[PDB]
Design a protein around this ligand. Sequence first.
Ligand code: MG
Ligand code: MG
Ligand code: MG
Lengths: 63, 282, 49, 59, 59, 40, 46
Amino acid sequence: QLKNLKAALKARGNPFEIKAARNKRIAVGKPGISKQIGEEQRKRAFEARKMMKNKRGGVIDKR
Amino acid sequence: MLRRQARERREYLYRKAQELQDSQLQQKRQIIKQALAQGKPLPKELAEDESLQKDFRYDQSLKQVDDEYAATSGIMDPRIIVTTSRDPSTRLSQFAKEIKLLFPNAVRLNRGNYVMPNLVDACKKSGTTDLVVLHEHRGVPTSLTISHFPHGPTAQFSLHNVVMRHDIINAGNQSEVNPHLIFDNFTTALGKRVVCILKHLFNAGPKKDSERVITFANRGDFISVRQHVYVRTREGVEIAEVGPRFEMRLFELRLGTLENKDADVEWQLRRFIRTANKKDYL
Amino acid sequence: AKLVHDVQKKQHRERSQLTSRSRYGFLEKHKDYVKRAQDFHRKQSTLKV
Amino acid sequence: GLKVPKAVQKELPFKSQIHQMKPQKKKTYMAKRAVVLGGDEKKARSFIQKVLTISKAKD
Amino acid sequence: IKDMFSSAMEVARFEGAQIKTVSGIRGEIKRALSKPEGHYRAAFEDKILMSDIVILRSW
Amino acid sequence: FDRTAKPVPVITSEVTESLEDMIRRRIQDSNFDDLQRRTL
Amino acid sequence: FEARQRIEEKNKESSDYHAKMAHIVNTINTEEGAEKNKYERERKLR
RNA sequence: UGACGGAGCCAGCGAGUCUAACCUUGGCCGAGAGGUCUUGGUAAAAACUCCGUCGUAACGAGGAAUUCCUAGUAAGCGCAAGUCAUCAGCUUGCGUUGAUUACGUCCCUGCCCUUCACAC
Ligand SMILES: [Mg+2]
Ligand SMILES: [Mg+2]
Ligand SMILES: [Mg+2]
């Protein structure tokens, strides 16, 4: 890999973040990016629940 | 050989038991040395010990790596055999090859019908220094045990988030130089013990310009293992992952070879104690 | 017994096995479990020797 | 009671070898010959093992 | 363990939860069993008996 | 309800970047923890 | 995810409680003990 | 290089007063709790050797590519245990039967190393 790395950089001046399948007849996804989005969305949702736990009022904006 | 190995263990065990008793004596000698240098009065128990003061004349001329590794640390390169469980799947065989490439002096051995006592006894004859045995679950590596010969220790790890190199397209062949090693966030005595076990699977004295680096990063008792190839640029360093990726969590450490189920346990993971999740041991 | 009412030192009664499970036997409590664990460790200790 | 595996029991040092007597099946001649005094001696022989049972329990 | 839950979906919500027996043996909900629905696998600090009852504390 | 143990960490992109920063720093400073040949 | 947050919250709460309880005990022992030892000496002086 | 049946016969691991179903039809006793009986359905060593009988929609041993493998190894067969992580959609042990082919070469492809006598 390093020999390709040296060749690319001297021309210019992480393949483990992609899951790739076998072509029976190719990049399939982004495990790092997909999990982060799926984890952050439930993180803010958890934040909303901890804000909603002990409240009874609320601004009712009908505009 | 069998008789020789037996007595070497009895002598070693006896030495440990005596050293624990002698630890108090060593502290007492330290107090006398400090008292003589500082000039401060000696405590009452030590003041009245005539035997200790007489011995101190001989013991005045008295002055690291773990004892199992101290004999060969930095002299003889390790010899490693990487094997698996009986009837391994295709992926475990591939993973065992990946672990073989990780350690420069590793040799992969097929475990067809080999019984555990014969495996270690055969390894001890051939001069093997470590034995690595891998387990799986439906072609997913789950556990990794490392047994150091001739008398231990045996450390068992559980592997999570394993990403093999065969899962990559056009990855290419690895470089097999003696790699640089990074051990980060290993603070407790157990961490120092774990580091010593893992450090001695690699050869001593990598070249300063070696272009392969293996890092073990401790993050809440989950040791991330990554392999990178770096190039020193004019304004910094650029690294690229070679793999595989996986996180090992120690859950047992025994004072003996992996055959010995009766070996004294140096450390074990207590999962059901009340305050288990509070503290991180490593 | 200083500054403790006798009401505080009241006996708490012991519950029993469910009838649906009466066939399996007596519902063990902590004291019963201690008898098992101690006996097992006594035997395993000698066997290791 | 504790039951030592026979594999362990086989390769034990001479000093620590468990003595496990096997049961008798074939009727021994002396077993066929011994006379047990019945009647009055039976009652005086049940009485004693009742007394020694109380004494062991009381202690 | 059985009768704790009705479907394997419920078990998935509670995986990793602390459980204990009446005897006081502590355990964990490891994984749900595919067959039958509601059964699950647990690991305890010591061997439990059939007469034991496992309880999960919730609020 | 209570949980007996912390779940196994998930390797997000942020986690990898934090790891990579450490490795680049160690190489740049040229400090590594590796076995050294003993004299004689 | 919920398990991770609950464990971290519980550990933080426990650490705060133990620090708070130690502080109130230490401050009482130091300040009230000083007054106690001071008064006792005056009694000895008498 | 089959199916059925019968017969002969060969292992090694493994021993916590602990080991383990579900849903119904009804009789009797009982203040109740419940106890006992009755009842139908659902679920849940092998190889090897010898002898006898028959008989030769989907799919009939799996394309291109790609991966692994050197002796008690590849492959076949069963039996146990479930050991604080993992595992039962399974995991790990244990024994049984047991080969073909190479054990040379740097030609290709990668990784690496180099530039105290006598004799050279
Ligand atoms: Mg095989
Ligand atoms: Mg099998
Ligand atoms: Mg397997």
